[PDB]
């Protein structure tokens, strides 16, 4: 239930949630093939009093290094009005996910003169060069670039 | 600066050590008031700068100013990737790309 | 300014008039022609490259607007000038390797 | 011979600004004292700032409320400013409250009052509402230190509660002059003048004491060697 | 300036340190700059260079932990630039590993 | 650099014969639990975990320090392969 | 979410002593690849010497 | 926020390494940067401050029957180290005469009361037979560094003033590296190294430095 706490009854994440790598965005089930349990596996379940289940977790999770705040979901079925999809598809679900992106070490900066570089370090304001009236500079661009 | 010399603060001791140096460089005219000379550096785009790790000045006058600088579409978030093992290719059995 | 104009991303006033309502979602303007045109705001649209194409409003109720004035800022637009980045206080010096 | 304890002047202006002089100190102690205090004055001085927000009928930061011109992005960004001073010391966390409507330009004051809390910047603009525009917030401000960003503290009181970035530290700026001086006999001594600017939650002077206190506390760590 | 025969300089007379720490303690206290040529006594021979040129040599000498060898490798009477430094790394490499 | 590499290159006739001796010895130790080591408990490579110091797992760090001691023999055609691979599984079991 | 802090202390243990290989864009010579002891870091970017 | 553990490693009387970790972000510099300043400014030691030699007018001359020049002798004299054992003491003259084929050392300085020559084998000058040396050296308690041409102290016409190497600290050097404690990884680690002349000791030198700093903290007491 932990792994499901953010899904509506249909299997869609709730608009306005926080999703991170591993998280299911949409539960989906699919039927098992001619590998319906082999001996090794039928027996292992024979021990656990839970007999072979016939559907599978094919859900749509989030890929490594992505994630954000579910902003929206579109659900297109067929059997509903307006809609008809490529042959053999019952329903398609799209879920748009937002991220606020602060600047970070690795991002690339540039100015209109061809000066470009990758943020390599973020000092705390106390280390920044500053002028006598106490104000600290924002950016330190090395002169060897010019 | 004028804002300063009226708020109860004159020139600063590290601004003179810098000016000593700026003069050897040749940025400022020898024998001229601190304000006269800071003026001369300012006109050059240059100002006195203190390393915040020490309070000591930068041995020189620096170019500080206001610059238009954009964030490009190329962010580490879109580009950090690594794999122990994963999908493979039908005929070659070598990992996808 | 032109660039924001032709970029057809910022939002402007079709004829002289006055601002009826204003809102994170729409802007309705009473015109000298008695028409009540209601421009709605493309708020937080996803672009081909993922970069939020967001429209924000730049007038308040009652604001008396001549023709061709601004009503909402596109993305990368700040009162109608192309804002591709940020103005920062820049210092030009070696900094210890970084 | 050795110079002796110098004369501590103090020139507080309002609740925000201060000039703090020390005269005379041996040459080479202007900075010896003026920098490390400024470093502590920027990092380590506790303070307050908003930490989370429930807006009614809102579920995530990127939303939009009707009849309000500002988007939540800008409202969370107007609430970052809000500086809020605790009176009782052992208070760690408040929960301000708000609700306005009609054609009112909600400002920082329109927040309900609470005892042991003063809105040191009441004129701070929040949001613009028009005929029909509602609003019902529940801000949550917190004492704490430094800079702690939303992606880090995740504070949500309700469920649909947007974490916010906190500039805890109350120190808007810190400069310090060092000027030439003399105690009659000797030349090249230093007149340390320390500026401090502030929001009000703590004060230019209470900052300076708290700064020194930490500095003093740190030297204690050299007590016990191995 | 030519002074009583040999050519020397004002600063090689005012300031004369018996060891390198002292010259650098002078630099510590505003007395001289690193780029000022002075007189200092390092490993016997009483030398005319700067304190900077002296600090450099200590940099080498402390890093390879062989003060004698490090003294032969550097060429001191000259500013370090791409070539001299390249030459030092090759020379270090051959004789120290 | 690798602690004491210049002397390692001195033992071998060719840098690549060091690499093979190292990597071989490195694995003699990985399978055997190090029990054949020719180090004393103070020479033991140690890593620092959050709890406290512990024997270095990296069998190559070991192999190289071991090589410096002189307590190893290197060369070609010194033993039958299978008389080693059990005399050692005898003296130090898996 | 499930990754607990002592995973990282566990990794630190893991890579002790061993090196990784770095390659940069055109391997023109033998030195578009060199080996390095890696020290872990937060943030995405690689740190080159 | 644990108690920052503090570690010492001394070779002898002239060198010690002092490491203090972990520390919150920035502090390894906010600390012993000031120490740096202080330990070079304000650690009271002693220093040869003036020298008179019997037939010697000005600094830049050669003594006959002597191998060294004048400056050479003044340089060796810059290197003498002496401790004042009586807290009251604050000045001293040192007298030394000898001649013939000898080479003088800091031992050969006529002893004095509560005045300890630390480095007695320190060579001063060598004499050739027929070579005379008869000289008085003034020595004061003081701090920091004072060029000769800027204290000028002269006890008699023809005494030369010498640059004043007070500081028993010879160099300070500190290195603040990044370090991590479990989850929190931005902490400063403050290694600090302190060279002394043996007069005072690195560890001693530090504690004084620390003391001086707290004391100035209290100079934020009585406003006006
Ligand atoms: N088609 C390309 C384009 C780029 N590169 C790689 O990127 C490098 C190009 O960067 P430049 O700025 O053009 O070369 P630099 O040598 O870095 O120029 P500078 O001296 O001004 O730093 C060359 C090459 O390593 C490449 O291999 N193939």
Curated annotation (Swiss-Prot), chain C:
This is DNA-directed RNA polymerase subunit beta. DNA-dependent RNA polymerase catalyzes the transcription of DNA into RNA using the four ribonucleoside triphosphates as substrates. The gene is rpoB. The RNAP catalytic core consists of 2 alpha, 1 beta, 1 beta' and 1 omega subunit. When a sigma factor is associated with the core the holoenzyme is formed, which can initiate transcription. Transmembrane segments: none annotated. Belongs to the RNA polymerase beta chain family.
Curated annotation (Swiss-Prot), chain G:
Transmembrane segments: none annotated. It comes from the Bacteria. The RNAP catalytic core consists of 2 alpha, 1 beta, 1 beta' and 1 omega subunit. When a sigma factor is associated with the core the holoenzyme is formed, which can initiate transcription. Belongs to the RNA polymerase beta' chain family. DNA-dependent RNA polymerase catalyzes the transcription of DNA into RNA using the four ribonucleoside triphosphates as substrates. This is DNA-directed RNA polymerase subunit beta'. It comes from Thermus thermophilus (strain ATCC 27634 / DSM 579 / HB8). The gene is rpoC. The chain holds residues 681 to 729 of 1524 of the full protein.
UniProtKB/Swiss-Prot annotation, chain H:
Its EC number is 2.7.7.6. Residues 1-224 are annotated as: Alpha N-terminal domain (alpha-NTD). Keywords: DNA-directed RNA polymerase, Nucleotidyltransferase, Transcription, Transferase. Homodimer. The RNAP catalytic core consists of 2 alpha, 1 beta, 1 beta' and 1 omega subunit. When a sigma factor is associated with the core the holoenzyme is formed, which can initiate transcription. The N-terminal domain is essential for RNAP assembly and basal transcription, whereas the C-terminal domain is involved in interaction with transcriptional regulators and with upstream promoter elements. Belongs to the RNA polymerase alpha chain family. This is DNA-directed RNA polymerase subunit alpha. It comes from Thermus thermophilus.
């Amino acid at each position: 239930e932990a792994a499901l706490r953010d899904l509506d009854e249909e299997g869609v994440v709730r608009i306005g949630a926080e999703v991170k790598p591993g998280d299911i965005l949409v539960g989906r089930t699919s039927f098992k093939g001619e590998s319906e349990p082999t001996p090794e596996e039928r027996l292992l379940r024979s021990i656990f009093g839970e007999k072979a289940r016939d559907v599978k977790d094919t859900s749509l999770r989030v890929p490594p290094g992505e994630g954000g705040i579910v902003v929206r979901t579109v659900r297109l079925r067929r059997g509903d009005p307006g809609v008809e999809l490529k042959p053999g598809v019952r329903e398609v679900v799209r879920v748009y996910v937002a991220q606020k992106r602060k600047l970070q070490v690795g991002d690339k900066l540039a100015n209109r003169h061809g000066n470009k570089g990758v943020v390599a370090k973020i000092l705390p304001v106390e280390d920044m060069p500053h002028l006598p009236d106490g104000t600290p500079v924002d950016v330190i661009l090395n002169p060897l670039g010019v | 600066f004028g804002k300063r010399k009226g708020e109860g603060f004159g020139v600063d001791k590290r601004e003179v050590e810098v000016l000593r140096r700026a003069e050897k460089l040749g940025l400022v005219t020898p024998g001229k008031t601190p304000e006269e000379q800071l003026k001369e550096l300012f006109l050059q785009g240059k100002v006195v700068l203190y390393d915040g790790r020490t309070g000591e000045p930068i041995e020189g006058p620096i170019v500080v100013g206001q610059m238009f600088i954009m964030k490009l579409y190329h962010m580490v978030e879109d580009k950090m990737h690594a794999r122990s093992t994963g999908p493979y290719s039908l005929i070659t059995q070598q990992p996808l790309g | 300014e032109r660039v924001v104009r032709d970029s057809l991303a910022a939002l402007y006033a079709e004829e002289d008039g006055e601002v009826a309502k204003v809102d994170g979602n729409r802007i309705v303007v009473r015109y000298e022609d008695g028409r009540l045109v209601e421009y709605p705001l493309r708020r937080f649209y996803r672009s081909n490259q993922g970069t939020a194409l967001d429209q924000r409003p730049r007038v308040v109720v009652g604001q008396r607007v001549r023709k061709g004035d601004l009503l909402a800022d596109g993305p990368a637009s700040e009162n109608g000038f192309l804002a591709l980045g940020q103005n920062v206080l820049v210092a030009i010096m070696p900094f210890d390797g970084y | 011979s050795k110079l002796k304890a110098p004369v501590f002047t103090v020139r507080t202006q309002g609740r925000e600004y201060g000039e703090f002089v020390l005269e005379p100190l041996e040459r080479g102690f202007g900075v010896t004292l003026g920098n490390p205090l400024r470093r502590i004055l920027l990092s380590s001085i506790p303070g307050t700032a908003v930490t989370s927000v429930y807006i009614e009928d809102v579920l995530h930061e990127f939303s939009t409320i009707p009849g309000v011109k500002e988007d939540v992005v800008e409202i969370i960004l107007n609430l970052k400013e809000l500086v809020v001073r605790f009176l009782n010391p052992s208070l760690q966390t408040v929960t301000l409250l708000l609700k306005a409507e009609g054609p009112k330009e909600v400002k920082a004051r329109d927040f309900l009052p609470v005892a042991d809390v003063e809105i040191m910047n009441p004129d701070l603009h929040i949001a613009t509402l028009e005929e029909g525009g509602r609003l019902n917030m529940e801000v949550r401000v917190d004492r704490g230190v430094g800079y702690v960003p939303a992606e880090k503290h995740g504070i949500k009181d309700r469920i649909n509660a947007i974490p916010v970035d906190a500039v805890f530290s109350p120190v808007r700026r810190v400069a310090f002059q060092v000027e030439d001086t003399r105690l009659g006999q000797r030349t090249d001594l230093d007149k340390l003048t320390l500026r401090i600017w502030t929001d009000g939650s703590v004060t230019p002077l209470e900052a300076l004491n708290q700064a020194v206190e930490i500095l003093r506390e740190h030297l204690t760590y050299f007590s016990n060697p191995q | 300036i030519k002074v009583a025969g040999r050519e020397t300089s004002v600063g090689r007379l005012k300031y004369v340190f018996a060891n390198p720490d002292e010259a650098l303690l002078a630099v510590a206290h505003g007395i001289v700059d690193l780029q000022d040529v002075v007189t200092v006594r390092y490993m016997g021979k009483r030398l005319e260079t700067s304190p900077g040129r002296i600090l450099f040599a200590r940099i080498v000498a402390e890093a390879v932990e062989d003060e004698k060898v490090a003294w032969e490798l550097i060429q001191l009477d000259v500013p370090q630039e791409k070539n001299s430094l390249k030459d030092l790394v090759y020379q270090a490499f051959l004789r120290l590993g | 650099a690798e602690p004491g590499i210049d002397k390692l290159f001195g033992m071998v006739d060719s840098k690549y014969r060091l690499t093979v001796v190292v990597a071989k010895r490195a694995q003699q130790l990985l399978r055997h639990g190090f029990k054949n080591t020719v180090l004393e408990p103070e020479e033991r490579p140690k890593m620092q975990t959050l709890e406290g110091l512990f024997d270095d797992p990296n069998a190559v760090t070991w192999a190289m320090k071991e090589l410096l001691t002189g307590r190893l023999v290197f060369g070609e055609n010194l033993v039958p392969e299978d008389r080693l691979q059990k005399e050692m599984e005898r003296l130090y079991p898996v | 979410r499930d990754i607990k802090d002592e995973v990282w202390d566990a990794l630190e243990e893991v890579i002790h002593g061993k090196v990784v290989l770095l390659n940069r864009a055109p391997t023109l010579h033998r030195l578009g690849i060199q080996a390095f002891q890696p020290v872990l870091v937060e943030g995405q970017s690689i740190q080159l010497h």
